[PDB]
Design a protein around this ligand. Structure first.
Ligand SMILES: O=[N+]([O-])c1ccc(O)cc1
Ligand SMILES: O=[N+]([O-])c1ccc(O)cc1
Length: 299
């Protein structure tokens, strides 16, 4: 369908290890993008949450002007293997300042050192911590969960587990999430080479994160498999046109909508996976404005 965005096209055309080296390479790429398009200044405070699987470092972002009445809890992407609070600073800083929201960015345990479902547990525990702390920040105790890619998987799973875990969640923001590790979709078949997120990489991420191949069918790995989506938190689902994960994201949004979940589904045309941590693309800021607009309607 639609042409590639021009800046995206140029980026792809200009594109060209041990685990430690690969993690460093990912961090170096994130730094370079931040150097090209610097993040907004923002007040932050570091801390550590005691979870059921150990200490999890967090960073709380405080907006210049607080305008949104729920804390956001943000889970970074990176295939469950890469990324951290610093790689996703450019996005989180902008979410904080544009929405005018307190944001808790989470440094959950990475694979393969920690395996499925450890980060899911951690992410629930941090969300619960935030809900407990919210009144002392002058906020409502119901949280908004958010994440990109693998982080969007975590946000979606936390949301599905929330009622069972007595966790109050007001909304879920899924940025090009991974949701279905079982089924091939047309986008996954057709866009899995040459658009930054590759088939070989996704297979390797699964090998690092999952305990055994059978885990693909577990709903905490593949939340799109869950048959009952009724009563789940209001959902914003942002996809990229030329992303292998596009179709599972959009299908999940359709399923949420049909289950009576208030859902906004936005495809950014001509875009690729990862664009909301790539500030060289104006669509990153457009999508952050979509977040602000969506969250305005929650209260
Ligand atoms: O393991 N997986 O299926 C994944 C996980 C993350 C991602 O960005 C793509 C695929
Ligand atoms: O690490 N593992 O056990 C795996 C995980 C996923 C897969 O598709 C095959 C093997």
């Amino acid at each position: 369908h639609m042409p590639l965005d021009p800046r995206v096209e140029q980026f792809l055309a200009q594109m060209p290890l041990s685990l430690a080296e690969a993690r460093q390479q990912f961090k170096q790429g994130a730094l370079l993008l931040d150097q090209m398009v610097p993040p907004p200044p923002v007040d932050t405070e570091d801390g550590t949450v005691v979870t059921t699987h150990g200490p999890v470092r967090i960073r709380r972002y405080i907006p210049d002007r607080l305008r949104f009445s729920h804390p956001l809890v943000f889970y970074h992407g990176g295939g469950f293997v890469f990324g951290d609070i610093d790689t996703h600073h450019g996005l989180v800083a902008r979410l904080c300042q544009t929405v005018g929201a307190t944001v808790i960015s989470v440094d959950y345990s990475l694979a393969p050192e920690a395996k499925f479902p450890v980060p899911v547990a951690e992410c629930i525990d941090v969300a619960r911590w935030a809900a407990h702390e919210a009144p002392g920040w002058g906020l409502k105790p119901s949280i908004v969960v958010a994440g990109d890619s693998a982080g969007g998987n975590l946000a979606a799973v936390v949301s599905q587990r929330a009622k069972d875990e007595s966790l109050p969640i007001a909304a879920q923001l899924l940025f090009y999430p991974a949701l279905d590790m079982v089924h091939e979709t047309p986008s996954k078949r057709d866009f899995a080479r040459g658009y930054l997120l590759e088939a070989d990489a996704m297979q390797w991420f699964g090998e690092q994160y999952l305990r055994t191949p059978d885990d693909v069918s577990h709903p905490w790995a593949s939340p799109a498999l869950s048959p009952d989506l009724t009563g789940l938190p209001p959902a914003l689902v942002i996809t990229a046109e030329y992303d292998p994960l596009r179709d599972e994201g959009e299908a999940y949004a359709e399923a949420l909508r049909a289950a009576g979940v208030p859902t906004e589904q936005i495809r950014f045309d001509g875009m690729i996976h990862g664009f909301m941590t790539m500030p060289i693309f104006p669509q990153m800021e457009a999508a952050i404005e979509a977040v602000a607009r969506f969250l305005e309607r929650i209260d």
